[PDB]
Amino acid sequence: IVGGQECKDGECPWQALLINEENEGFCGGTILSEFYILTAAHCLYQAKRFKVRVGDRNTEQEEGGEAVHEVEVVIKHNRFTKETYDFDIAVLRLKTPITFRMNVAPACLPERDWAESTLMTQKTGIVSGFGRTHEKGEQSTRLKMLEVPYVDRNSCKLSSSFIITQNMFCAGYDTKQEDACQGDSGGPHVTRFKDTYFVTGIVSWGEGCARKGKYGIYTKVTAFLKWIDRSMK
Amino acid sequence: KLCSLDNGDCDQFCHEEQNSVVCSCARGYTLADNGKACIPTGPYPCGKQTLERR
Numbered sequence: 635i636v637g638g639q640e641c642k643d644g645e646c647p648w649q650a651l652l653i654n655e656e657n658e659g660f661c662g663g664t665i666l667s668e669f670y671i672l673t674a675a676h677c678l679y680q681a682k683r684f685k686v687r688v689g690d691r692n693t694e695q696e697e698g699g700e701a702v703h704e705v706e707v708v709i710k711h712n713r714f715t716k717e718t719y720d721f722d723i724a725v726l727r728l729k730t731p732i733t734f735r736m737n738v739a740p741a742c743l744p745e746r747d748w749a750e751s752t753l754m755t756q757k758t759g760i761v762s763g764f765g766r767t768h769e770k771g772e773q774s775t776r777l778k779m780l781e782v783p784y785v786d787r788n789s790c791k792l793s794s795s796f797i798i799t800q801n802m803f804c805a806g807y808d809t810k811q812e813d814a815c816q817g818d819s820g821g822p823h824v825t826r827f828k829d830t831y832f833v834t835g836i837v838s839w840g841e842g843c844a845r846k847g848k849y850g851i852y853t854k855v856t857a858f859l860k861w862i863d864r865s866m867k
Numbered sequence: 868k869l870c871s872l873d874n875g876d877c878d879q880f881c882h883e884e885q886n887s888v889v890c891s892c893a894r895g896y897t898l899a900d901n902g903k904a905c906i907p908t909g910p911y912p913c914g915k916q917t918l919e920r921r
């Protein structure tokens with residue numbers, strides 16, 4: 635996360651962290667239930683093997699509330715395309731269930747039509763993660779969040795060197811230096827409605843981070859709500 | 868009554884019928900007797916920040 639702020643205690647409890655062969659974070663995820671994590675399909679190719687950490691806010695402190703869970707099943711979208719990141723969505727079933735507690739709770743899946751009329755039409759959503767704090771920088775050891783405006787699709791397409799499919803949406807800022815970045819991808823984009831947070835996106839890609847004239851690109855979760863439900867059985 | 872004004876007074880999901888709104892809630896909540904509010908069924912309902920230390 636470039637700009638934004640550190641997540642306060644209890645404020646980002648749906649954040650998950652995918653950790654590679656060395657307990658190092660390389661992607662985010664979103665807790666959906668005791669057994670299921672939402673992430674980006676592209677993250678599956680970034681590490682040969684990985685586990686999922688929940689409850690973490692500071693990767694250099696063993697606070698005590700953190701837990702690591704092994705992955706039992708990977709459910710990748712069968713139309714994920716590496717070249718465009720179209721259909722950039724996966725669900726992970728864990729080997730053992732999450733115990734909800736302080737800093738560990740699921741985000742809500744919205745009904746599709748209501749999400750489109752009521753969530754996607756809000757001014758902003760929130761993105762969070764442990765990713766880089768500037769484009770060429772290092773990952774944050776502390777969990778960060780950032781409010782990101784929804785960006786209209788027409789402006790999104792004009793700004794992009796790469797195709798923006800209807801499985802994607804833009805969020806963030808034209809020139810203001812705030813965005814998600816490398817290491818945040820796969821993590822949550824949620825939208826608040828009367829103090830309840832609903833999954834609206836998955837951090838997917840960008841051209842650099844916080845670049846002038848570029849936006850953050852997110853998987854459009856409304857396109858996949860039925861797919862998620864099926865994947866979770 | 869319409870979902871476009873104050874979300875039909877629903878706490879969470881709102882849908883329009885012919886001449887009414889119907890509210891509903893995410894899994895882990897029960898729609899209240901008033902037909903508007905969503906009541907968590909457990910202590911870590913989805914979408915809620917964990918702010919009350921149990």
Ligand SMILES: C[N+](C)(C)CCCN1C(=O)[C@@H]2[C@H](C1=O)[C@H](c1cc(-c3ccc(Cl)s3)on1)N1CCC[C@@H]21
Nearest residue numbers: 717718719796814815816819838839840842850851
């Ligand atoms: C999917 N495709 C159309 C081919 C574009 C891929 C761009 N790609 C790259 O070429 C990589 C990676 C990244 O997305 C990364 C990156 C950017 C971000 C985000 C910025 C805003 C986001 Cl929202 S996610 O997450 N990882 N960038 C920063 C360092 C390398 C470069």
Ligand SMILES: [Ca+2]
Nearest residue numbers: 692695696697
């Ligand atoms: Ca920690």
Ligand code: NA
Nearest residue numbers: 807808845848
């Ligand atoms: Na920008």
